[PDB]
Amino acid sequence: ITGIPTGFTELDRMTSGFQRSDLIIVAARPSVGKTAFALNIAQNVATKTNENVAIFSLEMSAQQLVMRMLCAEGNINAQNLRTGKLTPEDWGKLTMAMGSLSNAGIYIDDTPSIRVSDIRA
């Protein structure tokens, strides 16, 4: 870190930050790890390390990814979520997974396959 927090002590030391002036890129094998990759870099660099993120979703839109991310800063998603309702003691660390992403500035684009025009507008 030199340096704005990248997210990990494994990732801040090597990247020295973060810095101002950087166009990064990340690619994986067939769904083998490129999405949640960023869904947890800038989000933990939006709820843990300072940066009001204008995020922009693609094939998987935002009114779907919140069912796939409320379970990071509140310990959930193995009880299970894609099965239904939860128990009144499991109604626990959701209200702090509901207090660590709500008092914050995360500003996404739900719009899928639109070119750079509308976005850089």
């Binding site: 299970n80 099965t83 239904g84 128990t87 009144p88």
Partner: protein
């Protein structure tokens, strides 16, 4: 001859139709032997469901040993010479009684039984049979009544109140659990009467386990993905303290 009487007795309460919904029940009812004369089965309406409660037989040195809570002492009295065996598999039990006391000491371990049927197939005379002989000696098989036990074992796990009557479902050399499936917070599954299954195969004990119905099909009952390949393993957590036998 009894259903007619009950029907008109509570016909103001007993909503109609349903016959086709409870078809399986009514058909299983007529298909089995059924019948009976320490207690007798009677129907009771509890909310939106009809249950089966036992009332002591109006016809009313082991009961200082044979004292069971949440059920009465008029209806605990059946032996093994009190024997007029009519139906099958009530016969296939003449080596699961006499040889279910000769090596059921203190921490003896293995496999008891899983009694079932419907809602009154001479179950309270076999959970009153096999056991007596164990306690005829200084051996083990505690009687307990779950559908009555739990009714406040949600709201009595408190200030020593029942707190102190409720660690002995874990430590008596043996203990039985009755007609669960009657009602049911889901904590009692793993806090009150699901705390009977881990502390009894960790030190291992020769405990009896009964029910209204059977372990191989009690694996898919309560779904009023989750408890299907997840409701089976409590009938598995059950399956190891005992070895199942028929009650036709």
């Amino acid at each position: 001859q009894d259903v007619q009487a009950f029907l008109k007795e509570n016909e103001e309460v007993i909503d109609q139709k349903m016959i086709e919904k409870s078809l399986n029940k009514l058909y299983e009812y007529i298909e089995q032997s059924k019948n009976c004369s320490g207690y007798h089965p009677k129907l009771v309406v509890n909310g939106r469901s009809i249950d089966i409660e036992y009332y002591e037989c109006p016809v009313k040195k082991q009961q200082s040993l044979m004292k069971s809570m949440y059920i009465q002492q008029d209806l605990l009295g059946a032996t093994f010479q009190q024997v007029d065996i009519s139906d099958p598999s009530r016969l296939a039990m003449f080596q699961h009684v006499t040889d279910f006391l000769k090596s059921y000491n203190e921490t003896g371990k293995g496999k008891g039984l899983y009694l079932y049927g419907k809602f009154g197939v001479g179950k309270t005379f076999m959970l009153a049979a096999i056991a007596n002989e164990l306690a005829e000696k200084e051996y083990s098989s505690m009687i307990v009544y779950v559908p009555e036990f739990v009714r406040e074992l949600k709201n009595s796990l408190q200030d020593q109140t029942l707190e102190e009557k409720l660690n002995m479902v874990k430590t008596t050399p043996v203990l039985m659990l009755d007609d669960i499936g009657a009602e049911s917070t889901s904590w009692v599954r793993d806090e009150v009467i699901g705390t009977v299954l881990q502390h009894r195969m960790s030190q291992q004990l020769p405990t009896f386990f009964s029910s209204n119905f059977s372990p191989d099909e009690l694996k898919h009952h309560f779904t009023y993905e989750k408890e299907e390949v997840k409701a089976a393993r409590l009938m598995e957590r059950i399956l190891y303290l005992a070895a199942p036998i028929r009650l036709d």
